[PDB]
Amino acid sequence: RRWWFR
């Protein structure tokens, strides 16, 4: 979601 956090 964020940048690496899905």
CSV table of C-alpha atoms in Angstrom, one decimal:
chain,number,residue,atom,x,y,z
A,1,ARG,CA,0.0,0.0,0.0
A,2,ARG,CA,2.6,2.6,1.2
A,3,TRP,CA,5.9,1.9,-0.8
A,4,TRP,CA,6.7,-1.8,0.3
A,5,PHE,CA,3.7,-2.5,2.7
A,6,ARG,CA,1.4,-3.6,-0.2
